[PDB]
């Protein structure tokens, strides 16, 4: 079972997949995608990264949405059911936007295709299962929208972030130097629109802190992670989403004003412990 992950390292959707693979000690290779030319992805009719192709010797299936990848792989790890059949339970649902745009959403994306035995094996608590589902969705429908406006809220942070983008990702020597400044400028302005369009407070940091408190509160003081003893897909989701900011001002702020660090480090070490 060989796994190749096409990604943008500092992109939350990819950080999520990595968090999951890292925690389930699954071996995988990563091919960094050039965000400008995206050549390493020209082979996939699915135009968004991350994309992960799994290979079983001769067989090979392409898993697309980041949450779908995680769900497919996860149910795979517990049910053993052939992966070529599992991605079938996460159908790509095309539909024309109310604005006339073709959009694809993946059905059942946050639901592990498990049977009674299997479920009990990973949740042991019917409500615990619908819970990660709810927070998994929360992670990328709310938490991620707090990143850009936060890591690009100031021209300095903007440059810091895009610098961290060019260094980390795959940019030619030239498309990098340029991209840092054009990029930070673009993103600084664009994040302004995102700040607005997503109904964020004027003080973007406060939406981040609140989100964090909401999460720690949800985790509660009766358990290490939402997954209880060990982290479940929800812990990995929030963590995966938040990590992308490691090294940036927003992250230190987040850590210094929210009581979320203990949970965060707990997941980080739960992961490093392969």
Ligand X SMILES: N[C@@H](CCC(=O)N[C@@H](CS)C(=O)NCC(=O)O)C(=O)O
Work out whether 47 is an interface residue with Cl ion (CB under 5 A): yes
Pick what 169 binds: a copy of itself, ligand HEM, Cl ion, none; C-beta below 5 to 8 Å, kind-dependent. Answer: ligand HEM
Distance between CA 231 and CA 70 in Å, rounded? 14
13 binds ligand X (CB under 6 A): yes
- What is the spatial distance between Cα 60 and Cα 56, in angstroms, rounded to a whole number? 6
Contact criterion met (CB below 8 Å) for 203 and 210: no
Does position 255 interact with ligand HEM (CB under 6 A)? The reply is no
Q: Is 165 in the site for ligand HEM (CB under 6 A)?
A: yes
Cα(5)–Cα(142) distance, integer angstroms: 24
Residue 231: contacted member of Cl ion, a copy of itself, ligand HEM, none (CB under 5 to 8 Å, by partner type): none
Q: Which is nearer to ligand HEM, 54 or 245 (CB)?
A: 245
Binder to ligand X among 20, 23, 63, 66 (CB under 6 A)? 66
Which strand (E) or helix (H) includes residue 93? strand 92-96
Write down the residue that tokens 């053993």 correspond to.
80
Residue 102: beta bridge partners? Answer: 96
Provide the 8-state DSSP code for 145: G
49 annotated among ligand-binding-site residues: yes
| CB within 8 Å of 148: residues ≥ 6 apart | 187, 190, 191, 194
Residues that bind ligand HEM (CB under 6 A): 8, 10-12, 35, 140, 144-145, 147-148, 165, 169, 194
Name the residues annotated as catalytic: 8, 11, 13-14
Residues that bind a copy of itself (CB under 8 A): 85, 88-89, 91, 93-96, 98-100, 105, 107-111, 115-116, 126-127, 130, 133-134, 137, 141-142, 145, 196-199
């Amino acid at each position: 079972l060989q796994l190749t992950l096409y990604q943008y390292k500092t992109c939350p959707f990819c950080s999520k997949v990595r968090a999951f693979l890292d925690f389930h000690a699954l071996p995988y290779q990563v091919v960094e995608v050039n965000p400008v030319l995206r050549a390493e992805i020209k082979f996939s009719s699915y135009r968004k990264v991350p994309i992960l192709v799994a290979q079983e010797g001769e067989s090979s299936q392409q898993l697309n949405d980041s949450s779908v990848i995680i769900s497919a792989l996860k149910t795979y790890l517990v049910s053993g059911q052939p992966l070529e059949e599992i991605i079938t339970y996460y159908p790509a649902m095309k539909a024309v936007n109310d604005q006339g745009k073709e959009v694809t959403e993946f059905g059942n994306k946050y639901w592990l295709m498990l049977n009674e035995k299997e479920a009990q094996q990973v949740y042991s608590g019917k409500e615990a299962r619908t819970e990660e589902m709810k927070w998994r969705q929360w992670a990328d429908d709310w938490l991620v929208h707090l990143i850009s406006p936060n890591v690009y809220r100031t021209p300095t942070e903007a440059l810091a972030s895009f610098d961290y983008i060019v260094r980390e990702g795959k940019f030619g020597a030239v498309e990098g130097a340029v991209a840092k400044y054009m990029g930070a400028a673009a993103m600084y302005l664009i994040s302004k629109r995102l700040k607005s369009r997503h109904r964020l407070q004027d003080n973007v940091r406060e939406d981040l802190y609140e989100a964090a408190d909401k999460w720690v509160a949800a985790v509660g003081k009766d358990r290490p992670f939402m997954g209880g003893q060990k982290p479940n897909l929800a812990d990995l989701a929030v963590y995966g989403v938040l990590r992308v900011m490691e090294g940036l001002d927003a992250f230190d702020d987040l850590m210094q004003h929210t009581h979320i660090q203990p949970w965060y480090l707990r997941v980080e070490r739960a992961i490093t412990e392969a």
